[PDB]
């Protein structure tokens, strides 16, 4: 259907870095495996990023509810692109967040 990416951060670091993209992933960033595993996914974010709406995903993730915003970012290019962008906690059975999973939908248009 509509093309999105995918990927896996890990909560249980403190600073939920990602452990798995997608293809769509890398091929829409501009950045390859070895400049996003490990880091958070922040580094694609930028001036004209609405910091209100990055509140609201700061805010989901320390409260482990999932949230979906409407991003600005940034290519590995420099240019700017439209995520919108939607977390889902994932716990263990004893309630414990261990992932944030992330579909991200370039909606330039
Ligand atoms: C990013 N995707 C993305 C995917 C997952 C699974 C998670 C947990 C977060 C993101 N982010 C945001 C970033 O990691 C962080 O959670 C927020 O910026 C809020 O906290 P900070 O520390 O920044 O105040 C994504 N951010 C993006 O800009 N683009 C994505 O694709």
Known sequence: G????????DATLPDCPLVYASEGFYAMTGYGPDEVL???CRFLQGEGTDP?????????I???????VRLLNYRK????????????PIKTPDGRVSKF??????VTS
């Open 2 to 9: 509509l093309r999105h990416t995918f990927v896996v951060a």
């Open 38 to 40: 490990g880091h958070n």
């Open 52 to 60: 209100k709406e990055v509140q609201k995903i700061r805010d989901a």
């Open 62 to 68: 320390k409260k482990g509810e999932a949230c979906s």
């Open 77 to 88: 290019d420099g240019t700017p692109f439209w995520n919108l962008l939607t977390v889902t």
């Open 101 to 106: 999973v992330g579909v991200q939908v370039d």
